[PDB]
């Protein structure tokens, strides 16, 4: 399938959706979606892997290489993260964004 031409939502509604043979469609059940999602995420990872090889390393990534192989700001930083985190009670934290959950409170 590879690089395929892009479409508009208009094109999708008006012509593209109808090119599909309806009796061949795969139902979007919980099981079928999970299988599709599994492959979706795997492709992202493969796409990203290729981009990583070409992207300049981050400051974080650089230190990590250096690791694996004067101004005292403490007072100001401590205060900053305290301030930054003081209202945390009313704020949902997604952490690093992996495996989020979506429970509703109140």
């Amino acid at each position: 399938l590879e690089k395929q031409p892009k479409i508009t939502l208009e094109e999708f509604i008006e012509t593209e959706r109808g090119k599909l043979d309806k009796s061949k469609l795969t139902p979007i059940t919980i099981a079928n979606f999970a299988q599709w999602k599994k492959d979706h995420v795997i492709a992202k990872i493969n796409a990203e892997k290729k981009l990583s090889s070409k992207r300049k390393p981050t400051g974080r990534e650089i230190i990590l290489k250096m690791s694996a192989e004067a101004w005292d700001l403490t007072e100001f930083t401590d205060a900053l993260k305290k301030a930054d985190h003081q209202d945390d009670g009313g704020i949902k934290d997604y952490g690093d964004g992996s495996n989020p959950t979506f429970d509703i409170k109140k």
Binding site: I7, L9, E10, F33, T58, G59, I63, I91, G97, P100
Partner: protein, 356 residues
Amino acid sequence: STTVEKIKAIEDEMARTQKNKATSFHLGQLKAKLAKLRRELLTSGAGIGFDVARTGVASVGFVGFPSVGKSTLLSKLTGTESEAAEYEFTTLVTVPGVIRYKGAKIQMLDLPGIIDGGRGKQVIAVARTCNLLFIILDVNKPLHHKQIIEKELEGVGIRLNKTPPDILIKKKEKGGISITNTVPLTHLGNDEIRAVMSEYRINSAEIAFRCDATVDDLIDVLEASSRRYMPAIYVLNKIDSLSIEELELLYRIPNAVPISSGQDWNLDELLQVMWDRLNLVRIYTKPKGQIPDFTDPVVLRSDRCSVKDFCNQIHKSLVDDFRNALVYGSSVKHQPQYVGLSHILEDEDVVTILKK
């Protein structure tokens, strides 16, 4: 107002005027007349930080017709059930909530006020000053709603998923309008360019086209000081009425994230894409002796991430006693490098400030 009446009169004329070689000049002028009027409506300390308190490093706006899908969406993204005010359609803006994603506080606003057919200008200003918009659609009936949402947003000078056009306009003294061209122009004639420039009462100028510019593109450039270019994500809810092949097909539409707010499908993707489009910059602080913490980045905005901005984000005084900064990362061309206040940082740079 006469000024709001003047806009309708032009929209009306355009709709009943057929578009040909003979009418194109006039229609060009009409578009320009229309643009000028619409900017006058914005003319007045507005939007985020003024009309509502700014409560994150980024603020993100939701635009959609009232529905169970959209209420569940917001409730789910923010973790708190919709409040009394989030159900009123007379209400213009609400804050469904603030989230934290990869260390950044992101304010989430709902903007029902953009759809309504003093305070009306406040919702517009807020919309214009968001960092990213989510346009919420029901994939079973997307077109009507999409068309209205876009018209309303374009109408108030928001340009979704666009970079400013590559047109240079140098204003001249004598010799009228002169035009340069790179890629051949498939959409503008000289007549139409003159139509726009004269309507803008620009006697003489030199205009250089480095893009296959449309008449709107030219106007945008003329109106550059008030246009707000912003990422927008088309959130296509209700995929459970589709199928796998149909779902796959939606990914051929740029800036679309298909979801199901009931099932939670692709909410994770929605947030990932949001993060990607916001282009925030996490800086990791490192003291001379010890290592960087990586737990608590200072998060800076895309257009406000100078070493100067980093300093100020930490404490007002730092600039006064700043010698320089040691930086590892993609923002410097050698690892590490000493830099000055004006040095522009990049996501996940590691920084050690030094005392004068």
